[PDB]
Amino acid sequence: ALPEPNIFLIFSHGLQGCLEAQGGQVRVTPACNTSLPAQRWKWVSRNRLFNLGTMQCLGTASLGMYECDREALNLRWHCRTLGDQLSLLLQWRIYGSEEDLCALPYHEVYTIQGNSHGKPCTIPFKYDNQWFHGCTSTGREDGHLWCATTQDYGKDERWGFCPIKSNDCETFWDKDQLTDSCYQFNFQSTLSWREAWASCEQQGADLLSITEIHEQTYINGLLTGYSSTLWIGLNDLDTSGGWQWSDNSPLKYLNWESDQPDNPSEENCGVIRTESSGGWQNRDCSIALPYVCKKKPVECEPSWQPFQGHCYRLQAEKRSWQESKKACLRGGGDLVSIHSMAELEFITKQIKQEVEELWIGLNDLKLQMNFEWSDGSLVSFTHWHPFEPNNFRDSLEDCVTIWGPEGRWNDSPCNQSLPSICKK
Numbered sequence: 001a002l003p004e005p006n007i008f009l010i011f012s013h014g015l016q017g018c019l020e021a022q023g024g025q026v027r028v029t030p031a032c033n034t035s036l037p038a039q040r041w042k043w044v045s046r047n048r049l050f051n052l053g054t055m056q057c058l059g060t061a062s063l064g065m066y067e068c069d070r071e072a073l074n075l076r077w078h079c080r081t082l083g084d085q086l087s088l089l090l091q092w093r094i095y096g097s098e099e100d101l102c103a104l105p106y107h108e109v110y111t112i113q114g115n116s117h118g119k120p121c122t123i124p125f126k127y128d129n130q131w132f133h134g135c136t137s138t139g140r141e142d143g144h145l146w147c148a149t150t151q152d153y154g155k156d157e158r159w160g161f162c163p164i165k166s167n168d169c170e171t172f173w174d175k176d177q178l179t180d181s182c183y184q185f186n187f188q189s190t191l192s193w194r195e196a197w198a199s200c201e202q203q204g205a206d207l208l209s210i211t212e213i214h215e216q217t218y219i220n221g222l223l224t225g226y227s228s229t230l231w232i233g234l235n236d237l238d239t240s241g242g243w244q245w246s247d248n249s250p251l252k253y254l255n256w257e258s259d260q261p262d263n264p265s266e267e268n269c270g271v272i273r274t275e276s277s278g279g280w281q282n283r284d285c286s287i288a289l290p291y292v293c294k295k296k297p298v299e300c301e302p303s304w305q306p307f308q309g310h311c312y313r314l315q316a317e318k319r320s321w322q323e324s325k326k327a328c329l330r331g332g333g334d335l336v337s338i339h340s341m342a343e344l345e346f347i348t349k350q351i352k353q354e355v356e357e358l359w360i361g362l363n364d365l366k367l368q369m370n371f372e373w374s375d376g377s378l379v380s381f382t383h384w385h386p387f388e389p390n391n392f393r394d395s396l397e398d399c400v401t402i403w404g405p406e407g408r409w410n411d412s413p414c415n416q417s418l419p420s421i422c423k424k
């Protein structure tokens with residue numbers, strides 16, 4: 001009915017055949033078949049190997065198919081040693097890709113809504129005395145996919161919906177009518193930031209990025225009436241002090257609360273707080289919070305140099321950001337708007353060269369911590385120095401400079417007198 005990305009056949013190059021469960025027992029069949037449930041295996045939780053025809057787990061001496069409740073016996077297998085053990089008790093690879101047996105490990109799958117607070121599915125689990133190796137629509141009404149979060153639903157009755165990878169928003173998302181972006185606020189869940197990351201990824205989505213004041217106010221609008229602190233995609237992890245959105249959105253808009261971010265050492269992940277009234281803080285990525293997901297289904301004059309259908313030049317005369325912009329206008333251009341990493345590397349290495357810092361034209365003059373290119377071009381990417389943009393020591397820093405070897409960006413008071421770069 002559904003897909004099965006993690007099921008594989010277990011194939012011996014010692015013999016020529018792949019493992020199956022026929023009868024009650026397990027043998028090697030040269031008749032390898034991807035379609036036959038007896039031959040196809042899935043790693044499940046607690047180091048167990050589940051066979052789809054038997055709906056049972058490999059066990060041990062000898063080898064057998066046994067119900068997976070029956071933890072007793074062994075049923076515990078480790079993928080590095082699995083081949084050596086088959087050789088001794090009956091070389092081995094996954095069939096057809098010939099890769100090692102650790103290539104399709106068991107991953108946890110976090111549950112949407114239900115009573116389990118987002119807790120991961122327990123695979124396999126018993127419901128109505130049947131065993132299941134994944135999500136089913138059985139026992140439900142509506143048809144939706146759910147699993148148990150306990151290994152016997154009859155006893156504990158702890159369950160939740162399955163993350164779906166969909167190109168639509170049906171039933172689990174709020175849609176902003178104006179932007180057609182979809183959002184999921186999981187308030188019951190308590191997950192670490194990395195588990196939340198994994199959960200939005202499992203739905204074909206990604207953790208919340210707030211790229212603009214509209215998006216922020218829509219978020220506030222959906223949070224009216226709650227008290228809560230949720231994970232967002234904003235995080236410090238990938239390199240320390242430089243903030244990034246989980247999805248690769250440019251950091252174009254900043255809602256940090258007053259005197260955030262703090263604790264640069266172990267507080268690496270952002271949260272949105274109804275308390276702050278939608279303000280942002282950073283926190284320790286290991287605490288368990290609710291969390292938010294989203295998805296949206298003629299070369300030039302002398303002294304200018306070409307890059308990618310545009311022209312660039314250095315203006316060496318030290319001037320305020322505003323006067324620099326005027327000198328660019330007097331030519332055929334505006335201050336340089338930067339939409340590529342390749343473009344930043346050309347600018348920094350070929351043009352900036354030894355000059356330490358110059359104006360680039362990215363500015364929050366119109367609305368604080370909402371950054372714009374002077375030429376009206378969309379801000380599609382940023383590269384900031386760590387802890388920038390800060391409006392430093394609580395002063396207005398309304399204009400952006402490139403600084404230092406790497407070409408990372410700083411916000412600065414605009415009356416500062418520096419060089420600049422233009423493009424047309």
Ligand SMILES: *[C@@H]1O[C@H](CO)[C@@H](O)[C@H](O)[C@H]1NC(C)=O
Pocket residue numbers: 033034035036
């Ligand atoms: C697998 O076995 C079934 C038995 O019904 C057979 O019909 C099918 O053609 C086999 N698949 C392949 C790929 O040979």
Ligand SMILES: *[C@@H]1O[C@H](CO)[C@@H](O)[C@H](O)[C@H]1NC(C)=O
Pocket residue numbers: 413415416417
């Ligand atoms: C920028 O303007 C402010 C306000 O008038 C002034 O206090 C400051 O000294 C100026 N800085 C420079 C570098 O001109």
Ligand SMILES: [Ca+2]
Pocket residue numbers: 364368369391396397398399411
């Ligand atoms: Ca500013």
Ligand SMILES: [Ca+2]
Pocket residue numbers: 388389390391392397410411412
């Ligand atoms: Ca600054």
Ligand code: NA
Pocket residue numbers: 260262263267281282283
């Ligand atoms: Na904090």
